[PDB]
RNA sequence: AAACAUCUCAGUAUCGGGAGGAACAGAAAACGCAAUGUGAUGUCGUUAGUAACCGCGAGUGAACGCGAUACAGCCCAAACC
RNA sequence: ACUCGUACGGUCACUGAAUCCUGCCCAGUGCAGGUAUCUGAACACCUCGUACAAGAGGACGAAGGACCUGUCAACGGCGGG
RNA sequence: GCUUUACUGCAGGCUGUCGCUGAGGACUCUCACUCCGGGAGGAGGACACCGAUAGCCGGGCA
């Protein structure tokens, strides 16, 4: 047949890359030698288009202005601090081993020193649990319990934009808006909507796949579709 | 059908009747040496293999008798033509 | 809309040029390879043993 | 008596034992961040260069390659194939990664003239020889009663035409009786059936 | 191959790289008319549709030797300096 | 590529606004988990065979399967007496 | 052209084995190799990645 559009995906095209020269900034936490006497004050908001949510400029001591991936309840003027000896308040940044058991965090390094990678969306956050000298434990917003280095920075408190998604996009119009800021390929065509040449589920005459949705891990791409080595299906149970 | 494990008939190789021994052919191990052998590795490899990518055929609904005669004073065996049996037991 | 004879009116842009190597009005203008001589894409001249009968 | 040189001959011949193990650890660790082709002040294994041709003087230049592993590196069929043609991964190509390696190093120098390679080694994902150029182009050698014989015109690119001793051995020209019917005096002489 | 998959068409078409006036080969770790014999290498005639291969199907297919053409043999590495 | 993205994410699918609802079936097929025992290739190992080798057999045994469990807003099914 | 539990194969994934590959049926270590870090250094570690092969699945493709 021909490749089904998941493959087409990864070319790369322009249909499918996300509008990076409309990006903002990389929003990692700064990188201090030791002392953490680096401290910047909210110079301004801004929405970031990569994710719906708002982002504060801050202008640092050593003249450093950058975006930085802001918590709910910062604003202009605030000061922030970032480094081992920071202040435990709601903005600031520092690593795991500083931070106090059962403080909301965000933005929270994988590997020390990478800039942050859990917890960065609309109104989330990590609760970090336990301490120790080799490992600490923190719950991510999946509810995941993951062991990570004292040594991982990151943010106190909650992404800033809670509650986004609590309100529909009624209409395809908002979708539309909201798709074209992002690497995304909209509106969805169904698979049993396509000709048999497109898809695994095209063909026939009434519209259904004509095989169990559920397709093994070891399946090649152009087969994977469906439900993706689904432990179970329904509701039931 | 029934059939006599040993009876008086003729041996080619004494050239004279004796008594012999009726037993069913039992087959005989490969060595997986002969040419054929050679030929299976050497022309076998990516994609289909001709012959040896073909399998197994089927079967007759009977087969025919498939006996040994052993003569039983020189020890030595001859073949005959068999005959479709659906079973061949033997008396004795 | 007809892909025919109305289709064919919106067709003013300029692809093909005169190629400054070989002469030919090859020279894509847009790409900057030229079709014929191969000018832009390669040193080499542009070549193929199928321009010609396999035997000739 | 023995010379100095059969004893760094010797010592190649189980480079995986004694100080040469530890010394191609050591290498090899510096080799696995230098480029595809680098040029070298001294043979690393100089008896097998000087029993190549090597020498020290001027217009002699030796270079290391490297070069991945492995079999082919093959894109499948996009158009019909008979079962026969279909095969993709067991595939490997018809030249050795020895002579893929000489290439490499006189395409880096383009007025230089591959003289001879050998192998230096190799890990898990790649294997490096060292190959001898000569400047066909340089008095000294226009003078050496040894190496002048690599400055004829016809001796120009030589090792893309198969006139390494690589190459020669690669296209099967070792045996001048039984199994080299098709090889000589050349593959596509044959119908390219050796 | 009266289908077709091994095989065939064929290492052909076509593609990448490269030299010359011609290229390539070439002075035996050869041959093995087994010999008290031949003596670098191309090529031409023949050996021969022979040996060998092969759903042992269709088809594929050499070599040594011999008669010719032309002939030509040498240089390193190491030992010792 | 997704991605200056990180589960309030984005990938893969089904249904197709709101409203009131969405029953029964895990035997077969699919996916997934488990698995005493069974079955399960090659390398290495052992025995026989060969002054070697081909080869035969053994021991060990991964995923997989047998077997058990979960799962239908998973493919689908919901009859005759 | 299309389909599938048609025939035969091919990608691809899973899995064992051999090489990479080191020291003291379960274990420690560091030195290759990998990843994080601007750097120091940190994490991991003879695994993983990669080459080779073997078994299984395999209309995704021929
Ligand atoms: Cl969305
Ligand atoms: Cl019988
Ligand atoms: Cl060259
Ligand atoms: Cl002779
Ligand atoms: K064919
Ligand atoms: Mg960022
Ligand atoms: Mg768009
Ligand atoms: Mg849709
Ligand atoms: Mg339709
Ligand atoms: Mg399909
Ligand atoms: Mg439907
Ligand atoms: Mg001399
Ligand atoms: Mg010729
Ligand atoms: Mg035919
Ligand atoms: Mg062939
Ligand atoms: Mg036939
Ligand atoms: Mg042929
Ligand atoms: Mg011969
Ligand atoms: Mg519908
Ligand atoms: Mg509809
Ligand atoms: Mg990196
Ligand atoms: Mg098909
Ligand atoms: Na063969
Ligand atoms: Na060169
Ligand atoms: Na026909
Ligand atoms: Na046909
Ligand atoms: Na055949
Ligand atoms: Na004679
Ligand atoms: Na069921
Ligand atoms: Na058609
Ligand atoms: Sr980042
Ligand atoms: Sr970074
Ligand atoms: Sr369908
Ligand atoms: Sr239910
Ligand atoms: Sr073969
Ligand atoms: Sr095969
Ligand atoms: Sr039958
Ligand atoms: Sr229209
Ligand atoms: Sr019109
Ligand atoms: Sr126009
Ligand atoms: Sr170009
Ligand atoms: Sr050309
Ligand atoms: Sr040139
Ligand atoms: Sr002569
Ligand atoms: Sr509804
Ligand atoms: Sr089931």
């Known amino acids: 047949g021909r490749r089904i559009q998941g493959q087409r995906r990864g070319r790369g095209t322009s249909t499918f890359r ?12 700064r990188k201090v030698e030791d002392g953490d006497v680096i401290a910047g004050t909210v110079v301004d908001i801004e929405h970031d288009p990569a994710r719906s949510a708002p982002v504060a400029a801050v202008e640092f001591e050593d003249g450093d202005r950058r975006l930085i991936l802001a918590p709910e309840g910062v604003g202009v003027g605030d000061e922030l601090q970032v480094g081992v000896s920071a202040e435990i308040a709601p903005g600031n940044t520092l690593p795991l081993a500083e931070i106090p058991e059962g403080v909301p965090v965000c933005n929270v390094e994988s590997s020390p020193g990478d800039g942050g990678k859990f917890a960065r969306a ?14 600490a434990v923190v719950k991510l917003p999946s509810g995941e319990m993951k062991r990570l280095d004292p040594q991982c920075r990151a943010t106190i408190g909650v992404v800033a934009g809670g509650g986004r998604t609590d309100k529909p996009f009624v209409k395809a119009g908002n979708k539309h808006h909201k798709m074209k800021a992002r690497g995304t390929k909209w509106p969805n065509v169904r698979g049993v909507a396509m000709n048999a040449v497109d898809h695994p589920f ?36 | 059908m029934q059939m006599p494990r040993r009876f008086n008939t003729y041996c080619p190789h004494c050239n004279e009747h004796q008594e012999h021994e009726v037993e ?16 299976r590795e050497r022309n076998s490899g990516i994609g289909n293999d001709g012959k040896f990518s073909k399998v197994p055929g089927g079967d007759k609904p009977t087969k025919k008798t498939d006996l040994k005669y052993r003569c039983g004073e020189c020890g030595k065996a001859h073949l005959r033509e068999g005959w479709r049996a659906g079973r061949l037991e033997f008396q004795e | ?35 014929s001589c191969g000018f832009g894409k390669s040193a080499k001249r ?5 321009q010609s009968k396999a035997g000739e | 008596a023995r010379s100095a040189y059969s004893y760094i001959r010797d010592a190649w011949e189980n480079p995986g034992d004694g100080q040469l193990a530890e010394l191609q650890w050591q290498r090899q660790q510096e080799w ?11 043979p690393t294994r100089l008896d097998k260069a000087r029993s190549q041709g090597y020498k020290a003087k001027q217009g002699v230049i030796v270079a290391r390659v490297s070069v991945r592993k492995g079999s082919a590196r093959k894109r499948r069929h996009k158009a019909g194939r008979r079962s026969k043609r279909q095969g993709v991964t067991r595939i490997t190509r018809r030249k050795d990664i020895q002579r893929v390696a000489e290439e490499r190093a006189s395409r880096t120098f383009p007025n230089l003239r591959v003289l001879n390679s050998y192998s230096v080694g190799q890990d898990g994902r790649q294997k490096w020889h060292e190959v001898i150029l000569i400047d066909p182009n340089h008095p000294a050698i226009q ?23 690589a190459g020669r051995r690669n296209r099967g020209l070792s045996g001048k009786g039984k199994g080299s019917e098709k090889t000589r005096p050349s593959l596509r002489s044959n119908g390219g059936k050796a």
Request: hydrophobic content about 20%.
């Open chain 4, 143 to 165: 003078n050496d009663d040894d190496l002048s014989w690599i400055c004829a015109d016809d001796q120009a690119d030589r090792v893309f035409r198969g006139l390494t001793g």
């Open chain 4, 32 to 42: 696995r961040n230098e480029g595809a082709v680098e040029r070298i002040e001294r």
């Open chain 3, 1 to 35: 809309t007809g892909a025919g004879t109305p289709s064919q009116g919106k067709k003013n842009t300029t692809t093909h040029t005169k190629c400054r190597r070989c002469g030919e009005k090859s020279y894509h203008t847009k790409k900057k390879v030229c079709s």
């Open chain 3, 46 to 50: 542009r070549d193929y043993e199928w």
């Open chain 1, 202 to 237: 095209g063909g026939g005459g009434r519209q259904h796949p004509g095989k169990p949705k559920s397709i093994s891990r070891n399946a090649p791409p152009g087969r994977k579709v469906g439900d993706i080595a689904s432990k179970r299906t329904g509701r039931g149970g």
């Open chain 2, 24 to 39: 069913k052919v039992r087959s005989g191990r490969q060595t997986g040496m002969k040419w054929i052998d050679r030929q």
């Open chain 1, 122 to 135: 609309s109104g989330v956050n990590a609760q970090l649990l336990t301490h120790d000298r080799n490992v």
């Open chain 1, 18 to 29: 996300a509008p990076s020269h409309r990006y903002k900034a990389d929003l990692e936490h």
